[model samples]
Target: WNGNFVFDSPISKTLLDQYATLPNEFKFMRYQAVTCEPNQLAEKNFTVRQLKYLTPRETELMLVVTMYNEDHILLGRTLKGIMDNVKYMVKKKNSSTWGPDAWKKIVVCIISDGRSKINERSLALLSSLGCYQDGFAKDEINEKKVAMHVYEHTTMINITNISESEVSLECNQGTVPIQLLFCLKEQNQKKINSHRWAFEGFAELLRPNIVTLLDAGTMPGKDSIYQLWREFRNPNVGGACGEIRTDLGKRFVKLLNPLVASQNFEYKMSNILDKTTESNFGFITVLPGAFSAYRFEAVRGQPLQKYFYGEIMENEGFHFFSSNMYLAEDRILCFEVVTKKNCNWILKYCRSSYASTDVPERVPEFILQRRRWLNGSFFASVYSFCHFYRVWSSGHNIGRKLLLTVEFFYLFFNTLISWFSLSSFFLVFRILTVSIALAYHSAFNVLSVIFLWLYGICTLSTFILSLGNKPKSTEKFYVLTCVIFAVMMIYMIFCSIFMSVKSFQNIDIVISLGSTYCLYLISSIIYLQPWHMLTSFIQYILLSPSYINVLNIYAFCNVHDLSWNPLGKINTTEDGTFKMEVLVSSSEIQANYDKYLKVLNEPSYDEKKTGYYANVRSLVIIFWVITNFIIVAVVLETGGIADYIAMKSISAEIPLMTSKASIYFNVILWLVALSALIRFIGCSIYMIVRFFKK
Candidate 1:
């Protein structure tokens, strides 16, 4: 979180090697308090005996538990376990003590990513379990020393009718006081796309410290939080994650299937191999969303806020949060913490702390869940690799820095290599054909040979490099799929190379050129056109319903009024549809045009507007059109195709520029050549200037 401290050496190997075994003993218990209590001797009897022990500063632990729909059954069990642990700790105290140094204060915030009002089932369960209550008993012994503060919008309201709001509490009774804030909002409005909503609540209510985020259904062992907290005691570590096991004990035959077993195996491998090693290097890319703890100091202020509600260019003149990026927000935040900024935050794996949660038990549901995770991880990798310059600077040592570089290189080149491996045959044919055509036309040079050789070597190297480092997974059926592709590629490349060497002619040249032009045009329009971003927005709005949901979540920004519970039962009064009628007249368009006029005259603004002039694709298209005219005109003049057009009309070589028009033909050729040179130089200068301006 702070850059003031410099590490004299890398993390000790001995320390990294520890934490592989689960702990046998636990030191701390969980605590719960009733809401809205007054000062008086009631059913509550507290301790007032003072202890002599003290630390440099008081420790604050904030526990954030989030509830989505259909999580009531699991939520009840989780709360009961935590509360039981708290009861034991409170009862075991030597005296009914209420001193600052006696016990650790516990603050628990329950965030519901559903309607503000508590549902019937949720209320009944909470009441039946006696974990959640409307009021706390009055305590006279140490009312001031041990108190519960609840902040909410309403006092006598049911959970079922609560509006989008938050609840915060202050419990200061133990060695470390717990400050809790529960954010309950309309799921549709500020949807918990990921765990961002929970984290955002933390930022709003607390300062930097050790904070634990647990999913609504996750049940952590009694010692999980304490174990995670212990990791943060070392200044070098900013985050810690416990080993997560799938909750298969809830179901019998259904959960014992092969798919579930394989998934469990994958998770085990990931935790033991990938996460352990990555954590050791201080570069664990993602902390699981289900249950993990982070130091608040590592994530605070604008950087963290932006990660939660980062602005994205929605359309011309409008920007919005990258809320549609729901899948990868957690990974993106991790990147921001460790790689984007020079934060130098280290993540540790704590095997001693364990949490178990249900995985997708159905096939389709499992596919969807895995897709989201894989997509998020891929995107997060791209973002990190593309911005590795910052990571290199933030890295603690040369080895770690080199590792980041290597990881980035492999990620970027792996895709390219995969692509080449798939299309090697076509690519080989194209290159050999184009080379032979140039040589036939007496246009080949040393540079051409050099390029061909390098291209061949680069393509071959990718296949070799891919084998060096690859994930070992149980899905052997899937693992050999890429290897099969590589073998197919080799056969295709060899065949195409043979054909290209045997038959290289003008017709092949024309076929190649025309097809390439089509590809270039398609690529240019999709990626390089000024209006391409508009297409992405349109696709998000009209084509993808999920993106619309994401957009709606972003619209709620802070206090938006829609609850999004995809897995929850439908209890919403509002139908999921666009209700507003949007219309823009010609007059409004003109009005928008006026604003554009003002900025057109701003300093260097015109230069910025000339960006299209420097576009390589645009320049290529321009030269292409110009070259077509020059080639056609020169062909007609030189009689290369004079009679080919002569048959179309009753014209007897009116002015083919062969004999009498030779002087004018020469002038025309000179002008065409000169125009091409000037345009090329001019565009080059435009791009150079733009680069300098940036």
Candidate 2:
């Protein structure tokens, strides 16, 4: 897949509108040998020209397809359908923000058994389905002139027997002819199961087109995710992954589930559904092989390809880790995109299912698919990607560093506190153990519970806020289900611990199924953690089993792994959780500030200006004082205020929300109020100092 072009305009609406429709005719197709120089293809009716330079905001979309003899026609249709789905994603005025000329920027490569005669038909179909082309007649279909090229029969002669008598075929730069390499292996009667050689060849080919490559077998319908990719390819995105699910099994949306069955090795998985979205910021363990796109420039610019491996997991996992560790890597690509670095990363998936594969029909294939995923996780965990995630999540300097420090506290600290409290209670019960202060034990558990409650409120508030125009029943169910899933996944930490321990021992517990005893030990560890031992053991037992379980659940969630699935619909009526209008009400506002006073006159020593200045200053001070007093009254009243008139008017939810709102917001409010009050108090202090001087 080697080609190039230039964008004359930044992003135009005309180009976008034209692209949304598939064409029934192609502009032209040239069949020529692959040569290092495009100029040599002139005799083959394939005119080659130099690729033009790209502007900062331009993006290229590439798709590579490989097919064998069994399903040639279906593959062609599937590819076209995939293009249709992509068309919806790359429009200008849609949910996605890609420019209109997205189609013109797309380069598609199809590889098949060279003997397939369907090439002409497929090209004719694509040309006829084209958006820019009008109705094309069958009488005009010229098989000889079809734009597609065929390798025909693979012979050693095509390889070692190259003769100067024929023009040589070549692969596009920055891309490998994976199909050809694999076909060659088959022709040689070698095992093609392990993708090593094929991947090596692909990597070599990828050198020239390092910026964009979009290859797939199938894509989900427009309803599921197709839109997420639109947002992903936005100017600023480094990478985005789709949610994965299995169309065959029952629906699962959490970390642990039933599909996490006994592996061939007897490693029973405890699959947990994940909340894999930009907003939640959780680990993404699985990606469907549906249509996924990437900002190749980002990957090429930042040298992200260096982080990848010949293996898919190694390739994607390292990319994820590196993106988080490097500058501007962790931020979701859509938000605050103000740069044009040929920066590179990837967007591997967007839906929760495998692409094209019907879950109901592919029970046996799950293991093979999941094994590839586990291999990736195995590589990622060794890398410790999370350790550097803060570099991307936070801004530059001390403020950023402070945020990085706080992220650990927000994530693991509460779990630590809970473990400590639970451990202390158990230790105190043991006669052999040294009993620490009872106050410490009670305080820790109580505080831990409070922290959990606060976290719950914040998460719940976020769910509510996300429901723009407010949500209804279905929405509430989804939100509440998310909460339940989140809490339940705390147990997955134990699963990780189990897997991590096994991994350290060079034991493939997941594949071998020889880890029942380890799992029991894991169950015990979670059920019995001593606070002091918690930190010490963290290094030994991490999340290998649980992540495997996550991958398992991923495949079961959808029909195909589209990765662009939408969060299911929500309703905003009866039994709904939030009512924003109630909090910002007229009666509540007046009643809350009823007792605060306002004075329009006060003494001021303005030597140049007199009475009017004093009046204005006094009004300003009064306004500031009244607002601060009311705020303070609210804080004190809500800080465990069980019995108060104001408390009666405030909803229990409001008290919960006040406690849950960011600690930063609380601090900022206090800082502003305190500063204003200090200004007034400072003036009073100055008067006293002047009197003393007199």
Candidate 3:
């Protein structure tokens, strides 16, 4: 009746029987139904209260939450803030400011290491939060496309996908549903690379909007996400960093708790003094993992997989960073983005966007935490220096250049002095104890006597200075000093016993004592360059054999590896292993095509093939090898192996090397002395120049 496709009644028997003889429209209708309902019509537009017009706008945000074995109570608090932000956006969506139906652009993705750590209690609590509700009724709710389940207050459909390892909830708000992708895996995961892969997979499904990455332990402030988002208003700002506030409300064992408190103060001061300036200059050193937001382009089409799984090749044709990189993942990424000249990417700091995290409160935990950070910083700083020239040529301002130079000198001086002082202290202490046993009164020459007194004086001064700089919260500094004193005393006591047993086996006490003095003098001069006492305390933990590894040298080889977390309780062979899976998603294949093209065009890509840089690396390797051999020789000789096996063949030169080699050794010592002096004078001039300019 209406369009030659109508039936007189509801009967379809006759219509189907005569379908071939009927009109083409009627035949088409029988096979396929109308695309839209005949009753469907456009809603009437009524004139509403006044609103101004502007260029219409649309914005989308994707929040990516990463979790580890974080406490559920804290995690709940973190999620609560995010939910509040979601509701606020929902309320604003209908308004003229946001225009109609703008909130649907937002998405939330919470990914956890496949640990099944979030229990039912936490799940129940999240559900109880009024952001979502169960089912819907026509009379009680507005009629809308209810694709799946329905939230009560809002008539939006929820397309939820729940699985053993992944949970996907897509809320139908506007043209596209806001997706909340939650992943919970069953296996332990590495930190950064795991995150890189997860996010890349999400990108494969659909391109990301604005991406916010947060650590599970980080509890965001009310507007942290919004504040981070606002940074994208500046098109050039590729990344934004949030401030990290360490929570220190709980005291750990009253005696050592102030150390943690002092750290709190230190963190505040560092941000104010260093980060503020660095941020303003557009080179924030670390966009820390705790809380950060990035523009889509900063991540979307980049070779993120290559960047995360960063690697280096050794002289022996071995690769690095697949397992050895356990720290500084965030810093390296920040470096990559900020240093990309063509990208014109800017890393900004939003002071108002804060994240609160728990700090280590116990001595052992504190020491371990600092060691990992110090070790990472030590390597990251060197890596940055290697690329300083490239950065400078990229049109960075003079201030940034000056800052980089200062940072380089600071690290260099600290490394040289710290290594020298520590190594010499132990060696001198060993020889002094041995001499006291072998011939106490007769072994004491004027030079030896003077050296012993100087050592005692320096040790005493170090203790007093440390105590003077102690936090006002307690008198724990004296306890620390006493502990340091006792440790050295115990070591000397052990050395005396061991050397007394070995002296009867024809050991050359003279050569040992003479060589020890040479080591001590070098250390004393290098230590004369004012050192960072804090770094020394941190190194005390790092220098332990358990933490030291031969693999650390790769950090100097211009290859970088940043892992999920470096503060794992123990270092084991199992810690370095990870499964090989998808390297990059299908989307990245096209996105990173140009990057791979460049990779193909480059040479064998060997840093060592370069001239000046290659020579510098070679010298560093040689120095490292020689130092390690010396340490090994010292261990063997101290155990009386040299005396029994090689004393007659070695004569009275040194334990391992010969008298002929002693001349070469003397020349090397002189060169080191000359180098240190040159650096000392240069540092003095640099300081004077800065002072006068100021």
Candidate 4:
């Protein structure tokens, strides 16, 4: 329960002297790392290496990072909750010794990434927390200090030349001071995108140098690192995995793809501690790029192969393992861990709240890094499948090995099926169109409309499930995020398909690329403003590579455009066009019959047999029958024909519509016609009774 803001520097004598003058209550309080007896003291006081109040026990635990760039209220509430939890844990079962200034157990780190300038309101909020304070004070601060050392950059680095920008980038690299949340609240307001790069750099730094992150200068404790190590490493296991949900706004596709994708890595380091040793994978599966625990040994054990040029090592590492492994790199890691004995995977949710601030409220580097990670997954799949059979047989278990082989084949099989189905559908549609043209019938057109409606209904069913409910979650934020994610998946898939088609046709990638961009551009125009459209355009551009790579995999045997053949299309159109024009212009009628009808006055048919009422009644019956027919057909097609009929029998509502005026009238009539009416009323009474249950 470490509740200390980030460390900046060691406790100063002036600060210590100031504390001594408070009261007798202050005399007994432990000043971070001060010797004290718990029974004699009402509360313990301790700060981290940089004067961060890490723990009272003198033991450093986990280093929790808090990034706030938006939503001052939510971030404040979340921090308050964390503080409350720490207080409860420390004071629980209050012994004489139980109080603040307790053990030094954990540290909370905060990174502003410079988000202070959003608005006057947000600045006021940060001011209330003393975020602009020059030095440490016993005031409310939203931050952490896990690392024993506090690093700070006092001056900003600016690039003078465009050509030398990369060099300038190198110069700007420095540890973001977490303690400065007290004073750095507005730093990231306009500089939000910078946080992305900072985090990516931090992760990259960790990949090759985890020990440095554990060093006392970086953190106050080794136990936290040890626990993190134990959590990730299993001798019998290859790696751990988890999912990540990020909020970079809806226009953050560039950053989101890689951030979510990197979690696919399973760091496998099998150590021969002794010849007969074993280990198990933990509860976590598919370490998400957002926030996940990893085994250092597993990460360090594998040899690094270049996956992408200057793309970063973990991206390639994940690909290498995923390709070498039989399943989705993430899924396979989980499966392997579960299939083995003495191993468990932790699938707990993490609400890291990585970036919540008030300034420009952005993080750019992280977005770029994440996009790269997403691209890596496809690359790894390809590398592993180059020698499909050999790689498929590499699995340890026979059953699993076979399953892997099946999966490899499944990709190809799905492509073939999709192509064949699309092609066959068009061919049949062409035949139907020709037949209808020759016979001049409207029935085929009506049937086609019905088919489209059925497709819409099925797609709607999937849409509901994808949203998690028919009405969706009540939380607006969650619902929006889910919808955005769904859109991203669909759009990416389309891009992949489009790219694959282009590659096979030897068409310029950039030519049809505009088509993919058009989808995004049109949506932006329809739904967003100029600024938002610009943001979305930028994000799509960043995400293009990953989309293309994915599509290439799918288009191996399927061509997108070739799946369609225009009906009535002919190379030579003059004769057909002339004939078609003549047919359309022609109006055939019996001149004799017209004259005969003109000569004779018409009389209405007998009402009992064939008047408007009779026809209208017939339409109602036909409509009701059609509805039933449709329901039956759908049920039968889904292989649930018997169950559907059983349901209809049980409801006893099927015959109520037969005598009604129309489908709409039948719906109303059934409420009263069927025995279901009575049952519903009875059930309503029962529901009322149940509502009052104790």
Candidate 5:
């Protein structure tokens, strides 16, 4: 059931008079205290502030920001970016298709999961931006009221009694008016709960064709939203994610911070190479949480919406496996979208569309962030691989199913490659030393041919970002980053000399290492352009091993640490200490959870609900198996073990090259090299397209 309440505003008359010829269907909407019929939950538990421009229309998209703890400044930037995206879209294609009234087609739901005195800052920012000045302050926004309507049916948020609700943002594209339902629930629930509140309470009612998700600090590029919007023109594209670029501070200076720079490089490849190539195959695994658009009809009708909103806890109802899976829940949504019964949907990646998000600037912070990612992805990938048969069960045709199968296997191996990369990196050096002692010149020669520069240039500058202290400490983070970085440079050179000294007469080693370096450098240059090569690329290489080893160790060791975004990370304090915000699971999720499980159909609640230590032990054993496999694989490939196995009479022989050792090195090299070349080929294609279009 819908309800409307009126409010007094100076501009109301002018706006109405200008559109007087408009249909009388808009007469009942307003800016006063709109109330929803109190249901069981809303009567007691929910305090909703639904803000909207007092006009009703069939909105095309719903932009939901499920946020907690992002300060007003970043939140303001997010809102401003939304306006820019819309204005830019209209400016470019204003033939009455998506302009002259870009406002009515959009609605924004900004839901804060928990209440804080700090939350008032966001409230003030909204009000300052001409949000709901007619209603009241944060108290009314946080006041006890239900946003639930008599019928979950439309996008007219025209009834909330919040001051910011009457807001109209003016842009070059004309009145950028959106139905702004700003809800700050009194309960301190998690991000997923915010999703539940926004989607369950408002999105279903609005029936938006597209739902775009946003993280608070993430800012969309000028045309980022439009890029996602355009892709939905195809009926089969159920979900689409844009590139997430890290905000690596100002100019080239931020590149000096290795932690941030490594992240920058990774984000670049994750988008342009990883996600884009996966998109070419028609099944992107993860629609990033920071900013991705989804088709509502598919999700609301699919089996996934229920599963996605179900709560999984560390203490009960699920194994560490499922816990980790939901920790990185976006991938779960994609998997279900692809394989859900009766679903004929696909996921997409838009490379030209990009959004900027904050990255961890400190080592501890970066490691902490990676811990969750490694654990979540590890489980999610395995889960998808184990049940890949379900993909065939979906509504795909035989050929599409086969494409999905091949892509699945490709990613399975890609995930599987994680096991050996670290072991391979460490073991190769030892194997080379052993070969030298055995006087196996060809063995050493072969090894040196390809992997020589793998450690020759060595890697990431050893730097500490004092970014923890803000302007008070920026110089401290940057300068110390430089100092440690200089020491690291010297350190890398010394190691470089040691390696070359070992093969003093071997300029052939140059060919070994140089090829990989050239490919990597070219990839980086094309991915982020040449500026990255001078700065972040060096740091990324140096820390590549460090990231693999310690990051894996950190994640598996603390897999049960299912805390939400560490509150103190933003404040640059000792994690949760600065904010004094306890990052604990809400103890108040009793009643709604029953209905949650009902809808989810008891997803992660079945089978062994315990895998705490089992998950950790799994990691240890996997590494153990992969390490031996690589060692045996290398020995057999060398022809020493294989020859010995056949003769059955030889046990000890000098490390002989039964096979070309360098060929073994070239095997792994080319595997990756060929893959990297695909990106180069991608570049070639892009170049030809440019010339032809010209």
Candidate 6:
């Protein structure tokens, strides 16, 4: 992981493509280490291992990666990826805005939250990258060859001495700071707290044109930083986020896991539909913290920053209970950009830039994660609507406002509609699964009841702990063996086989089957990767019911644990109840506040409330469960209203869709649908190829 020349360009595509366009004579040189001087170029006779470019750089740029409990391997890769991208951008040096080296001012800061132990491994790596803190022993430094391309370029600014590392790194009056790497000291805190330091501390100290954000595992592309930066040329653009792809490891074998594959599909579609749709209104709901770029001027001390440093709920119980507003800080950050002072600054989807992050492979981990996300995202989305009036007086014109009105209403009802969509997917599943079983026109009511019973049990077992007010804080892998997966798999096979046989015999039903297949196929091709249409379809269809049916139910039921949203490290000893201390007195709160001041802080030494069983929250979840059970499981005659819910009428022994005609009308509708489908397919293929080409 060490010992490499920085100034020299490697024989990689990122270098080679840009290399071919160089305007000046380029020669090679060998870098030799020196004791008197740190490093210097030497005239070598044997081989050419160097390259040169006269790129001028400026405009301070800062990139921050927030991390905690992350291992050195991935952290190193994340940091290295950014370094490589920086080199790529420097080598190519944008022809227009960047102009020579006007964009070379750079700072990379990594803030470790206090929740984690000392990451000596990361410190060592940063040390070799030319970062130093006085506390570390010289013997502990992992010495390595510096990338001359990064360090050799410098500035002569006199006022850039906020930190003392410039002197230690051998900088003088004539030289300047470029690509300064900082692994800031630890503060056992949340991801937001890490950002608090990086933004409020560093950005305030040394102003930059842009402040790009990153997480520990996300690997940014070599040219992505420049792509993210270039968007700011449009003064109206406040922020931009790039495509986030699943990092399907070296061999791309992780896709074999349905959990990972389904997420990839979900991520792809959401990025396509979610970001692009919101961009039209200049109100992109959220710019993910994983990989995003924000203009410093727009947010330095604006509403976004105020909320960034906003006072969260002060009471411990209130703060811990309300997870959404505090945990989903990105929503408020993005919301303020579009709404503050009716600022018309827009957010964009940077297609040319992308980053790769991963999904959890563990079942329990995935479930808990969704609980936080589902609760946080839904609540925050609604929270922004309260500030909708800010849009009317905005600088954007009437057309954009009308579109915003339509989108606002749509987004509102969209989430409201989601509240009841869980069992609807089950209805679709039953339409396919028991289609042939009911063709004989018997046992419709009884079989439907039987299926509902099994479904209720599946949901119940998944949520047993949450219903009892025992909040899950950490993963216990063994708990996932609750038969949900086994039942879903078996029913999936039966559902497909039954549909296949019936469709084979009946041509009309075949069209229905074919139509549904085409629908998913088009979505898979368009939203997911081009070739992923089949490999993941079966797995997705099989597990999706269980995904929502169980996940939605479990998430809502377990929404009491707001503290579990921290990016890393989970406390396993929590019962879903608040300690009386946080609520009982201002003295207790005062003492806790004092402790927080001291812990500005260290590890988890702050006082925690002694929590009792979360009885009220448990009752709330129990009622929700009862409401779902009544509408979803109980039959009509039993006064539960299941049969009364829809016109489809409780899975009758008949089909809802049938061929209307073999002539003009049917052909017209079919052609229309097929036309849309083909456009989607063509565009999807183009995007896939374009992505690879980029």
Q: Pick the candidate with the highest lDDT.
A: 5
lDDT of 4 at 470: 20
Model 6 misses residue 678 by how many Å? 15
Query: On TM-score, who's better, 1 or 3?
Result: 3
4 against 5, candidate with superior lDDT: 5
lDDT of each: 0.44, 0.32, 0.46, 0.31, 0.58, 0.55
Q: Could you tell me which 10 consecutive residues in candidate 5 have the lowest summed lDDT?
A: 151-160
Model 2: how large is the Cα RMSD against the reference?
32.0
In terms of lDDT, the poorest run of 10 residues in model 3 is 44-53
Q: Rank the candidates by TM-score, best first.
A: 5, 6, 3, 1, 2, 4
Best by TM-score: 5
User: Candidate 6: global Cα-lDDT?
Assistant: 0.55
Count of clashes, each model: 25, 94, 2, 84, 14, 19
For candidate 3, write residues 35-96 as lDDT tens digits: 22112211211110011014322337767667666445655656555654555555554444
What TM-score should be assigned to candidate 2?
0.33
- RMSD values for the candidates in order, in angstroms, are 22.4, 32.0, 20.9, 29.8, 13.5, 15.5
lDDT (0-100) at residue 150 of candidate 2? 22
Using lDDT, rank the candidates from best to worst: 5, 6, 3, 1, 2, 4
Query: Considering summed lDDT, which 10 consecutive residues are worst modelled in model 1?
Result: 153-162
**Cα lDDT for residue 64, model 5?**
84
TM-score of each: 0.45, 0.33, 0.47, 0.30, 0.68, 0.66
The digit string of per-residue lDDT tens for model 4 on 1-694 reads 2533333332334333433323222122121211222121124333223232243223222233344444344334333333333344445465433344322233333444343333344334333322322333333333432211122211111212212111111122221111221213323332222222222322222222121111000111112233332333334344422222223434544334432322111111001010001111122233223333333322321111111111133441233333223223333333333333333222222111121111111223332333334333433344334545553324245554454455445433333333233222222232333334334344555544544454345334433432233222333432333344344444444444544565677742243345434533433232222343343234444333323322221222111112117575556645445455454432345666778799995453342223433343345335533554454334223245545665978973332112212342233224223322322233333334434742
What is the per-residue lDDT of model 1 for residues 340-366, given as tens digits with 9 covering 90 to 100? 355567666676677777776543354
Residue 460's lDDT in candidate 5: 21
User: How accurate locally is residue 437 in candidate 5, as Cα lDDT from 0 to 100?
Assistant: 37
Instruction: Give me the runs in candidate 1 sitting further than 4 Å from their true place.
Output: 1-59, 84-104, 116-119, 128-182, 190-197, 200-204, 250-255, 287-289, 311-327, 340-342, 395-399, 410-694
Model 1: residue 30 alpha-carbon error in angstroms: 21
Candidate 2: 10-residue stretch with minimal lDDT: 152-161
For candidate 4, the lDDT comes to: 0.31
